[PDB]
């Protein structure tokens, strides 16, 4: 039973990545669905300042083909790397999360979650206005990445 099996670790790691994912998505949708004019959707992909992402420099699989090819270790690194890339900048959205009626995103949840998740990934490894809009897109993409990667690593070593 527990020596904390590895299912435990993977189960919890993903769940955590999954909340940060709903958190990241929903506040992203909300923000846009409340501040961005229909004609301004995705205006961030093309703007001299808010084009760049906190992790532009990190290696990331762009599909199942690539992702599954990576192993349980290189997938946890990308995820841990990605996570840390967000530790300081995620606080730029602090307000955004605090003036948000999104389910569970107020006080300091998001940043805290990032921290615990960093610890969980770390453990598994050894054992193994448009500016605001832009960042929220970025955070969701990256949160989706982590979630997607850890789920893969999770469904590798049960589930269905």
């Amino acid at each position: 039973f527990p020596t904390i099996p590895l299912s435990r670790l993977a189960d919890n790691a993903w769940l955590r990545a999954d909340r940060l994912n709903q958190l990241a998505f929903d506040t992203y949708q909300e923000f846009e669905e409340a501040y961005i004019p229909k004609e301004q959707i995705h205006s961030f992909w093309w703007n001299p300042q808010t084009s760049l992402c906190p992790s532009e420099s990190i290696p990331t699989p762009s599909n199942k083909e690539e992702t599954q090819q990576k192993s349980n270790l290189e997938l946890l690194r990308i995820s841990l790397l990605l996570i840390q890339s967000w530790l300081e900048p995620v606080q730029f959205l602090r307000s955004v999360f605090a003036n948000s009626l999104v389910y569970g995103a107020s006080d300091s949840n998001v940043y805290d979650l990032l921290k615990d998740l960093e610890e969980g990934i770390q453990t598994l490894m050894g054992r193994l206005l448009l500016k605001n809009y832009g960042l929220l897109y970025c955070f969701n993409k990256d949160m989706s990445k982590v979630s997607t990667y850890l789920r893969t690593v999770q469904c590798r070593s049960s589930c269905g």
């Binding site: 994912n21 995705h42 084009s51 762009s62 599909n63 199942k64 599954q68 989706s144 789920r151 269905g160």
Partner: protein, 193 residues
Amino acid sequence: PKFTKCRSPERETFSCHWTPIQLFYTRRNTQEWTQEWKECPDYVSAGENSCYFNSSFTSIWIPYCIKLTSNGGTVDEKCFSVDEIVQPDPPIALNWTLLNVSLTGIHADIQVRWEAPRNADIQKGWMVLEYELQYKEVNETKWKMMDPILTTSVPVYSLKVDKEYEVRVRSKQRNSGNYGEFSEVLYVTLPQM
């Protein structure tokens, strides 16, 4: 002509539609936008007045932009990344199980269970599916919607044993895209005691 929409059924491939008309794409793949506008890789597979992109052309968390070209210049132009356009297939094998009947013979509880779309790689974890099940007395106009679950099973309480019910189930990728089409409806008739 205009774009009707785009949809990735299993987060691995996607196709765009509209109502000689051509479609070209470009995406932020090598880094910034250095991919020379290209033309629909497949005009037939996804049916007519459509374009189809196989898993070798589909990339996630990547920005795509697509142009509809007509007789005279650009006619339509849309931009996205696949996850926004993910719409999973409907779940299959809808089937109920009687749970229990009250001794008043008025109410009953049933467990509704179903299977995951066959094309969604949930087994390897590329996809995490979430479902919404709606049910309603057969002669109603309004449907009663359940809170999204992640399970492929759920109980449905306090049904009136004297009524007949019908159930449908929707599918969506956990945290992205939209729900898909509703499964086949399941009709339920409780034990006529």
